[PDB]
């Protein structure tokens, strides 16, 4: 059960391969490839949206 992922390659111009050998998920290597991103939680917690090109205070 080998897993083939993608290496960090760079941008203006390849895969790896991993097999887990231990019975415990804690033994696994790092999740260095998780790129989820949601600023909205902290940057726009306002209940009434807020459009940019609009008069902020009506």
């Amino acid at each position: 059960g080998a897993q083939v992922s993608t290496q960090k390659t760079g941008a203006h111009e390849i895969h790896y391969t991993n097999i887990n050998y231990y019975k415990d998920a804690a033994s696994n290597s790092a999740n260095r490839q998780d790129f989820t991103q949601d600023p909205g939680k902290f940057t726009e917690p306002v209940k009434d949206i807020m459009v940019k090109s609009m008069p902020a205070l009506n």
Partner: protein, 271 residues
């Protein structure tokens, strides 16, 4: 990955992007294109290295202590009650978040040194150490040869000198749904007693010793302990610690200035 800057040109509208009301507690989502003529740029920059995991996922010394081959009873063995607050570096990083959940990769760097009352023909066989983890409640050792070192249940590592840093992985062993880096509360319902983060701290103790019994010449060994968070999840970010740390068990601080100063609000001379 980051955003491309989309080309924009002249404007003469009644849409006012630059003007907002920060009172709302909302950060403006403005970009260059909104206030100037922009050219198009295909941006390839990635935010790979600022991911919480890559930020915390590097081994960091959290402590070290020493013990001696021979010399009797304090000296003989050492112990440390596990906690991440006795070092500045790591502690400040974890503390950028209120709660966190993660696995750990422990690595130990163990080194030995000779002490002065030397002796002749001193030719010591290689040293093997034993580190034992004693979960809260387990019978703790009282001298280098207490029965508890038989570890029928506590986990321990036996490692010999010259052979590469022993290492293990430990799961999220917390009893809550996350490790709390802050706790604005007390341990007792009557508020008497301890207050603060230490009320939560109960992760056990590490115990180390030499296995080969004391030889002629005295030797001192130091055990450096490394923590490396893995499989990290972090909630409720907070401001980075400003004031230096004073105590390991609380947030006590000496008031300190918000920044360094400069001569006037007009000085371009970077400090």
């Amino acid at each position: 990955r980051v955003a491309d800057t989309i080309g924009s040109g002249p404007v003469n509208s009644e849409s006012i992007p630059a003007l907002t009301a920060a009172e709302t507690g909302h950060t403006s989502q403005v970009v260059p294109s909104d206030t100037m003529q922009t050219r198009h740029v295909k941006n390839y920059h990635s935010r790979s290295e600022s991911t919480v995991e890559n930020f915390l996922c590097r081994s960091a010394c959290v402590f070290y202590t020493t013990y001696e081959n021979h010399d009797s009873d304090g000296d003989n063995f050492a112990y440390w009650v596990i906690n991440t607050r006795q070092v500045a570096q790591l502690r400040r990083k974890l503390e950028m978040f209120t709660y966190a959940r993660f696995d750990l990769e422990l690595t130990f760097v163990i080194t030995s040194t000779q002490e002065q009352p030397t002796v002749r023909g001193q030719d010591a066989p290689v040293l093997t150490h034993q580190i034992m983890y004693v979960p809260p409640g387990g019978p703790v050792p009282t001298k280098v040869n207490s029965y508890s070192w038989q570890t029928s249940t506590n986990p321990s590592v036996f490692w010999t000198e010259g052979s590469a840093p022993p290492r293990m992985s430990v799961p999220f062993i917390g009893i809550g749904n996350a490790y709390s880096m802050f706790y604005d509360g007390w341990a007792r319902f009557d508020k008497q007693g301890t207050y603060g983060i230490s009320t939560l701290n109960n992760m056990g103790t590490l115990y180390m010793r030499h296995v080969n019994d004391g030889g002629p010449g005295p030797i001192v060994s130091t055990v450096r302990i490394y923590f490396k968070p893995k499989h990290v999840k972090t909630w409720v970010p907070r401001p980075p610690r400003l004031c230096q740390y004073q105590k390991a068990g609380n947030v006590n601080f000496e008031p300190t200035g918000v920044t360094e100063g400069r001569t006037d609000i007009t000085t371009m001379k970077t400090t």
